[PDB]
Amino acid sequence: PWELTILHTNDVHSRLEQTSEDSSKCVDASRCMGGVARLFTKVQQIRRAEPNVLLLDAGDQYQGTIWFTVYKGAEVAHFMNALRYDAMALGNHEFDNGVEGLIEPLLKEAKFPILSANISASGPLASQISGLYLPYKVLPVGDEVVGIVGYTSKETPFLSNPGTNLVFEDEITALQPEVDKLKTLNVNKIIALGHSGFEMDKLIAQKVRGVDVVVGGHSNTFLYTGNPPSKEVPAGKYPFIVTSDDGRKVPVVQAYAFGKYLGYLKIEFDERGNVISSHGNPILLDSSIPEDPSIKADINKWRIKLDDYSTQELGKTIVYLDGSSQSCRFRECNMGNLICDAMINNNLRHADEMFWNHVSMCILNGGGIRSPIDERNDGTITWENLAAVLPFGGTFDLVQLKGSTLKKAFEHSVHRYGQSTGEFLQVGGIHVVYDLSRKPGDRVVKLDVLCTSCRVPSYDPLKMDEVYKVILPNFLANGGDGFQMIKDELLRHDSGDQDINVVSTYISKMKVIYPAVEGRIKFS
Amino acid sequence: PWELTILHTNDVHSRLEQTSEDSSKCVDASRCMGGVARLFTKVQQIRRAEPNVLLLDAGDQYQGTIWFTVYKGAEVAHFMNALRYDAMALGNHEFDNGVEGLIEPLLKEAKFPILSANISASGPLASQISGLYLPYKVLPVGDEVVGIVGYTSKETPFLSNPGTNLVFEDEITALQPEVDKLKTLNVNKIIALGHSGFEMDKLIAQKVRGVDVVVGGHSNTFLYTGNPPSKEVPAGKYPFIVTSDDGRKVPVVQAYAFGKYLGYLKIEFDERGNVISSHGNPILLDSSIPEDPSIKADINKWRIKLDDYSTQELGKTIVYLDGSSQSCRFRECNMGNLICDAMINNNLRHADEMFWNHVSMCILNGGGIRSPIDERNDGTITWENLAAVLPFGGTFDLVQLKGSTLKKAFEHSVHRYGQSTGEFLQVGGIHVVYDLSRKPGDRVVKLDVLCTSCRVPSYDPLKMDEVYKVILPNFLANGGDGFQMIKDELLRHDSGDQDINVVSTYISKMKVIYPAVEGRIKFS
Ligand SMILES: [Ca+2]
Ligand SMILES: [Ca+2]
Ligand SMILES: [Zn+2]
Ligand SMILES: [Zn+2]
Ligand SMILES: [Zn+2]
Numbered sequence A, B: 001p002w003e004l005t006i007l008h009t010n011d012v013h014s015r016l017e018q019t020s021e022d023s024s025k026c027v028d029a030s031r032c033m034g035g036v037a038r039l040f041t042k043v044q045q046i047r048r049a050e051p052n053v054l055l056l057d058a059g060d061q062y063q064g065t066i067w068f069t070v071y072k073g074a075e076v077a078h079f080m081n082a083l084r085y086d087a088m089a090l091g092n093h094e095f096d097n098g099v100e101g102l103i104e105p106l107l108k109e110a111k112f113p114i115l116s117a118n119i120s121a122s123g124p125l126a127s128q129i130s131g132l133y134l135p136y137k138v139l140p141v142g143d144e145v146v147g148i149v150g151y152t153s154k155e156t157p158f159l160s161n162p163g164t165n166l167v168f169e170d171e172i173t174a175l176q177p178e179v180d181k182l183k184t185l186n187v188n189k190i191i192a193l194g195h196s197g198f199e200m201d202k203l204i205a206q207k208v209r210g211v212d213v214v215v216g217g218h219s220n221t222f223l224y225t226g227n228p229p230s231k232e233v234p235a236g237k238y239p240f241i242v243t244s245d246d247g248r249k250v251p252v253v254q255a256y257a258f259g260k261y262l263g264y265l266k267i268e269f270d271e272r273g274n275v276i277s278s279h280g281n282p283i284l285l286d287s288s289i290p291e292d293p294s295i296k297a298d299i300n301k302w303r304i305k306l307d308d309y310s311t312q313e314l315g316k317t318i319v320y321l322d323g324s325s326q327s328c329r330f331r332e333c334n335m336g337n338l339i340c341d342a343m344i345n346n347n348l349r350h351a352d353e354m355f356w357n358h359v360s361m362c363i364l365n366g367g368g369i370r371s372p373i374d375e376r377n378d379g380t381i382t383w384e385n386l387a388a389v390l391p392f393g394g395t396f397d398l399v400q401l402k403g404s405t406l407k408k409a410f411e412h413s414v415h416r417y418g419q420s421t422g423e424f425l426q427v428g429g430i431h432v433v434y435d436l437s438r439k440p441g442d443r444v445v446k447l448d449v450l451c452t453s454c455r456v457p458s459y460d461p462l463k464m465d466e467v468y469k470v471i472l473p474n475f476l477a478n479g480g481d482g483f484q485m486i487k488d489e490l491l492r493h494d495s496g497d498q499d500i501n502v503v504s505t506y507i508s509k510m511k512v513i514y515p516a517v518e519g520r521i522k523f524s
């Protein structure tokens, strides 16, 4: 048999530096993890030992830390080139700075092919981008070749800023003709590498005839065979085996997010390109693996500009930004309004005639707001100031929630009101009235929400059976602060932009901010 | 006696072209008035006939029409130079584009001295601006000399954008030493030319010893001796005679606004520079005076760029901008919210530790909103679109109103509700609740207003005895739409920026707008 070792990352999300165990800022180095310097060490070790290796990325290198804010993808090209990635699929966040912010720097600077078979362009853009990403690439590996066919979430227009020219086609529809073309070219070993989420990955494995392996991303899915090595709880075995409609067993892999793990899958192929066996597991990139000194020194050189940027003025406030717990855990606070307004602004995407914007609503737990910002430093706001407000390295995500779930969340917000607990909700696009004299669970007496399917935005009563898009911290989407109903009842969840970056961009665009307390939250 | 003819304009406010009788856009040419081409004809006629003539401007050439939006003061320098003005005082609106927007183009391009004795600078700005405006200038007139000493409203920091370096001193305090200096230099004929309003002009005439004549502005004051020639009602005789504390009679003049009139005052002086007599009247620049053909042709050449600008995209809306009367004369409408939010943004001025901004509140009669804007032209908004919404050429002014007056205005807003009348108020920084089942005059059941003297803006009940700053159309400050209580009870009133320009600037800054209906106005 011919044995291939697939090394894979996905949803690295700008974690160029090593991180804490929870993928926030590294504080206690002896317990830090990931980063590209440590990844380099492990990849180099494996390449010394195994003859046939591919290093693949399933997208979403863009977005996640100040690295992306400052270097805008140049860090991705540089460090992925240093790691010698063999191929990458486009993720949704590769469109965060528009198609221009993808073409330059990433597509023009990567030394490896960048792939997606289900994105097409028209008009002048089609000529500008032709050949800069590809549906697939056939790569030599030893004396053999392996075809790698890419794909990107069809939902990218709702989850990034690709513009109005690009069209994202159904993944399976686009993939099948490319995989059949590869068969006619005598390519019998085919990896589908792409960025649509574990559920779509399983459908691709089932339905796209000729795919031998699926290497996915987007959903931050952790798969593991055996006892988990850290705190992530597996969603299934690694690999996850799909029985295909052609009657093959097709392994599906993913490797969590944030560069914490290196995916590692060994596949044995017969002479006709059929998978005989597949086995492996993601490797936890913990501190037992040394950071490569050369990569680490280059990381430290690149960090200088980040340190400089972090103390520069982003914009000004003419109001005190009240992020105190005494305010934000007890009543509407103007820091909460600012952050929710920034969240909504970050999620303005292109709209058809059926909505002014696809999402209009925001919730933010007061426990997530960790500092005020004083306006008496000549009004200046810096990144460092924002990092005191939002210190946990999270994202502001998009979910779909039934009205009944959202009502339960607002009841939870005040179920033990008066104790300065973190679950009290700041809001945008929502007007809530509580009556604290009522029993816990029955304190929400009015709950109105901003329409989306309307040409003039206005507030209407929340409807229990209707599904609402809401922007909220990943912490809450994951059930933090007791919001188990959100985790258990949500109907869709996609990871969004970094928390600080969302607020920084809004402040920079607005130039001068003056958020008020304006009656979004009232008490009878 | 030595006879001097003083020709004077003030508060021309970008009326380069002839206007209608009410100083809006000229529609019926046979009834149009003013403009620089017609002014040229009349000034030239007078200079043919009278030996000793000065042509003076008392400030506020900046701001008022698309001319200023596009040419940013270059039109002021060019056409004032063509008219051969002899001197100009700085007005408050000369600071609308900051000190940089005054230095270039006006101070560097004017061929006449520009004056203000009560503005000082410090640090590098002082060196940059030194000598570009002057406290006074001594001008030869025939075989004599006349000193002209300038002044500018001490309130300019609240009424324009001068920045944080310039200091505006009390006018009388600054003027007296300059006038005494002129006496030591054997200058015995002294005109005070400046921009603080008729009330301050009378105080200057009374208290600044050695001033022979005051030529003022700012308050758009119409003075006339005899039957008025048009619709403006005189505030007093022309000249208005002040008895000075030195026991002289000192004439005070002003000439309305908008270039509709040319002020004309003849003064006889004795050999010692004492005024023997003064008489005159503003000259109505009506269509019986031909427009100078050469100036008119140059105006028409300069208009080409204005026509081009008027159809360019200023920014985008993703929402329908509902300026329909069926909405804005009956309930909160999102066009009204947009315009009030633009009004508040235009009035963000520098603030000390005692307020986040000096003004927080806006009212706008629905009768002033004359069109919607549809978002389905790729979201584009142009100046032409805004001119359909705001077609009357007015300004958004600053007033001080007792709470009791503002409550009466809100009662008036709904006193005959249900008839699609123009007085219904759109708002910003105000939350009102009406109960229409109550008697007219007693329908306002809640009225909360955004604080200014606060570091976190929030809403508090309106207080009847407290004085509030409010931004509102000049139409309403003048008692239009039945708001007689505003005209009769206001405690201060200063003219603001052009209505269209206020909204255009806000849209251009915001780039993408999405105003909602959000509960600023509710009905029980
Ligand atoms: Ca195969
Ligand atoms: Ca004198
Ligand atoms: Zn991701
Ligand atoms: Zn993704
Ligand atoms: Zn004026």
Ligand SMILES: [Zn+2]
Pocket (backbone or CB within 6 Å): B060, B091, B092, B093, B195, B217, B218, B219
């Ligand atoms: Zn003025």
